[PDB]
């Protein structure tokens, strides 16, 4: 119900750093109420690499309670930051406008040492 618009066409969602996730949803052929997530992510966070160009995203979405999980590998023709982020969370449709609330993990290397850093991103729709 509350995701009727979300599931039609592409939409742009902007987080606190100004980065933009563009999502498209396609129904799963076998998983009830589930969708494949496609689209692109543009990182606009100052003080990072891989800024200002689209990176494909992919994941999965559950319509029954509007939960999502999606990932980006930070490699494209413009810039390679040799790392990957996974976001998992939920669309909160309870307020005056929708907010996508996520926790993320960033896997990366610092020298020869692997690391996984956690954080949180909240996105609001740009319409």
């Amino acid at each position: 119900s509350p995701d009727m618009k979300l599931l039609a066409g592409a939409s742009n969602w902007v987080n606190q750093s100004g980065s933009v996730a563009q999502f498209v949803f396609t129904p799963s052929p076998t998983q009830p109420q589930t969708y494949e997530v496609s689209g692109n992510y543009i990182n606009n966070a100052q003080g990072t690499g891989c800024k200002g160009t689209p990176y494909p995203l992919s994941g999965a979405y559950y319509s029954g309670n509007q939960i999502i999980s999606f990932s980006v590998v930070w490699s494209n023709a413009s810039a390679n930051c040799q790392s990957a982020t996974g976001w998992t969370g939920y669309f909160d449709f309870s307020g005056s406008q929708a907010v996508l609330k996520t926790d993320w993990n960033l896997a990366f290397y610092s020298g020869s040492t692997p690391a996984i850093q956690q954080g949180q991103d909240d996105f609001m729709q740009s319409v």
Partner: peptide, 11 residues
Amino acid sequence: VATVSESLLTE
């Protein structure tokens, strides 16, 4: 000719 950074957080 992609620009390479050590990680997303280290330009």
